[PDB]
Ligand binder design. Structure first.
Ligand SMILES: C[C@@H]1OCC2(CCN(c3cnc(Sc4ccnc(N)c4Cl)c(N)n3)CC2)[C@@H]1N
Length: 486
C-alpha cells in the first residue's frame, strides 16, 4: 500500500500528525507547498520531526541525503528494507497512514446523485462503483446486473464511517476495502459487488478540449495525476537482475532498474554475465524499448541490443550534457566516420539538422558479416528544457510524426528505441504521446483514449514511466494539439 502519502497536508499538519499520532520511526510523504512540484518525507526521530526534500524535475525522484528513484513507492520500499542508509541515521519504520480519500480512483467528492447515476448508467458495468460527498456523509453508488444502480448511505458519526450497521471504520478507504472483501447482500439476494471503480478518465478523442478545460479549472489535473500515483504501489515488480553485483556498474542510477519480466535479455554472449542492459520492452495493450542513456561501459551492450532487436529507429530525448552533467555518452561516431563497438560496427553516414532535432543516418552491422548491415535512424531531440516540459507541444509532435513515418516505411523494423538519462521521464512521456497519437491516427477522431490507463499500462513494463504532473499535462496538451491540427 501507499497510505503513507498524504496529498492535502501542510508541513505544520504533518508535524502535529507525527508528534501526536506517530512514534520514533513514524513517517509520511507529501507534496510541497513552498515549492510546488517537490515532495517532503517527514520522519519522527528522537521526539523531533525532520523534513527531507525530494525533488523531481522530470527525470527521477532525487532525495536529499539519499538516492535517485523511479517512484515514491520504490523510494519508501528501499529505505524500509535497507536501514542505516538515510542520513546520523534516519529510520523509516512506521508509515503514518492517510485517511483522506482524494487520490482514490472510486472517490469523486463533489458530484450530485443525478450526475453519479448518469455516470454509472452511461459508463458503468456490473460491479462499477463510486463514492461521492452527500453534509459530511457520503453515498456509495454501485451498478449490478449484466441491470440497476443501488445507493448505500455512508454516515460519518464521531469521525468514523459506517453503512448503517456493523463495523465502524476510521476512513472511507477502510470501509470500501472491507465491503470489497465482504460484500453487502441485499434482502432478495443481490450482491453489491464493488468489482472496479467507475471509469471516468476514458474520453472520446474529439472531446479532448472539453476535458482539458475541466481539468484546467481550480486543479483537476493534479487530482487525476495524484490518483494515478496512488496506483504505483501495485507495480513493485522484481528488479533482481539489475541488483546483481556484475550488473551494478551497468546502471546510471543504482536504484532505477528494469523489471525482470520485461527487461531486454542480451544473447550476443561473450563468455559470464553478458545478458544485461538497463532497458525494457514496452508493448501497447508498434513496440518500444525504453532505456537509459549509455554509460562508457554500456555502449557495446546498447549496440548489441539494437542489433538483436532489429531496431531501426532510436529516439534520443536529451542532450549528452545538461546543466554540466553527463546524461548520455556519445555512442555514435562523428559524421562520415566508422567505429567498432565490440563485435558491432557503426558508420555515421549523414547528419541532418532541423530546428528541434538532428537526424543521424547510421549503418550498423556485425563485424565479420557484411550481410547483417541495416540502416538505423537516430532522431536526436535537442530542444527539451533542462527542467519541466516545452510550453508548446508542436515541436515534439512534428518530431514524433517524422519518427513514426520512418518506422512505418521500414518493413519488419523492430521496436523503436527511446532514451533520455534515466529512461523513465522524457522517455515515458514521448512513448505515451506516441501511443495515444497512434490510436487517433488509425481509429480516427471517433476513438476512445484513456491517458492514465495508458500510463499505468506503460508503468507496469518499466518503473515510473512519466515522472511529473507537468509531463502528464504535456501529454494531454500534445494529444489535444494533434487532434486540433487534423
Ligand atoms: C477527487 C478526484 O475525483 C476524481 C478522481 C480523479 C480522476 N479519476 C481517476 C481515476 N482513476 C485514475 S487511475 C487509472 C485510470 C484508468 N485506468 C487505470 N488503470 C488507472 Cl490506474 C486516475 N488517474 N484518475 C477519478 C477519481 C479523484 N479521486
Amino acid at each position: 500500500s501507499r497510505r503513507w502519502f498524504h496529498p492535502n497536508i501542510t508541513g505544520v499538519e504533518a508535524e502535529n500528525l507525527l508528534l501526536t499520532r506517530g512514534v520514533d520511526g513514524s513517517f509520511l510523504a507529501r507534496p510541497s507547498k513552498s515549492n510546488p512540484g517537490d515532495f517532503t518525507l517527514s520522519v519522527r526521530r528522537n521526539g523531533a520531526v525532520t523534513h527531507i526534500k525530494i525533488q523531481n524535475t522530470g527525470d527521477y525522484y532525487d532525495l536529499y541525503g539519499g538516492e535517485k528513484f523511479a517512484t515514491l513507492a520504490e523510494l519508501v520500499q528501499y529505505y524500509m528494507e535497507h536501514h542505516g542508509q538515510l542520513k546520523d541515521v534516519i529510520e523509516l519504520k512506521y508509515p503514518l497512514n492517510c485517511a483522506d480519500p482524494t487520490s482514490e480512483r472510486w472517490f469523486h467528492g463533489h458530484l450530485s446523485g443525478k450526475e453519479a447515476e448518469k455516470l454509472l448508467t452511461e459508463k458503468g458495468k456490473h460491479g462499477s462503483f463510486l463514492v461521492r460527498e452527500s453534509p459530511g456523509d457520503f453515498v456509495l453508488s454501485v451498478r449490478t446486473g449484466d441491470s440497476k444502480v443501488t445507493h448505500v448511505m455512508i454516515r460519518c458519526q464521531e469521525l468514523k464511517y459506517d453503512v448503517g450497521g456493523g463495523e465502524r471504520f476510521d476512513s472511507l478507504t477502510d470501509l470500501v476495502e472491507h465491503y470489497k472483501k465482504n460484500p453487502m447482500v441485499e434482502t432478495l439476494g443481490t450482491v453489491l459487488q464493488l468489482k472496479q471503480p467507475l471509469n471516468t478518465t476514458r474520453i472520446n478523442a474529439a472531446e479532448i478540449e472539453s476535458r482539458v478545460r475541466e481539468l484546467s479549472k481550480l486543479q483537476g489535473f493534479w487530482e487525476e495525476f495524484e490518483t494515478l500515483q496512488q496506483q504505483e504501489c501495485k507495480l513493485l515488480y522484481s528488479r533482481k537482475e539489475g541488483q546483481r553485483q556484475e550488473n551494478k556498474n551497468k546502471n546510471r542510477y543504482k536504484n532505477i532498474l528494469p523489471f525482470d519480466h520485461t527487461r531486454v535479455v542480451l544473447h550476443d554472449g561473450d563468455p559470464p554475465v553478458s545478458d544485461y542492459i538497463n532497458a525494457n520492452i514496452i508493448m501497447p495493450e508498434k513496440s518500444y524499448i525504453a532505456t537509459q542513456g549509455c554509460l562508457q561501459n554500456t555502449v557495446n551492450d546498447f549496440w548489441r541490443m539494437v542489433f538483436q532487436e532489429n531496431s531501426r529507429v532510436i529516439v534520443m530525448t536529451t542532450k549528452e550534457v545538461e546543466r554540466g552533467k553527463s546524461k548520455c555518452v556519445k555512442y555514435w561516431p562523428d559524421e562520415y566516420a566508422l567505429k567498432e563497438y565490440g563485435v558491432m560496427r557503426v558508420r555515421n553516414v549523414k547528419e541532418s539538422a532541423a530546428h528541434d532535432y538532428t537526424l543521424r543516418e547510421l549503418k550498423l552491422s556485425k563485424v565479420g558479416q557484411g550481410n547483417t548491415e541495416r540502416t538505423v535512424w537516430q532522431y536526436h531531440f535537442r530542444t527539451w528544457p533542462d527542467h519541466g516540459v516545452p510550453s508548446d507541444p508542436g515541436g515534439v509532435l512534428d518530431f514524433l510524426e517524422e519518427v513514426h513515418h520512418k518506422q512505418e516505411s521500414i518493413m519488419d523494423a523492430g521496436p523503436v528505441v527511446v532514451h533520455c538519462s534515466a529512461g523513465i521521464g522524457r522517455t515515458g512521456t514521448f512513448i505515451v504521446i506516441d501511443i495515444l497519437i497512434d490510436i487517433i491516427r488509425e481509429k480516427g477522431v471517433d476513438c476512445d483514449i484513456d491517458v492514465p490507463k495508458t500510463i499505468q499500462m506503460v508503468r507496469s513494463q518499466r518503473s515510473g514511466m512519466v515522472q511529473t504532473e507537468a509531463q502528464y499535462r504535456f501529454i494531454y496538451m500534445a494529444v489535444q494539439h494533434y487532434i486540433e491540427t487534423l
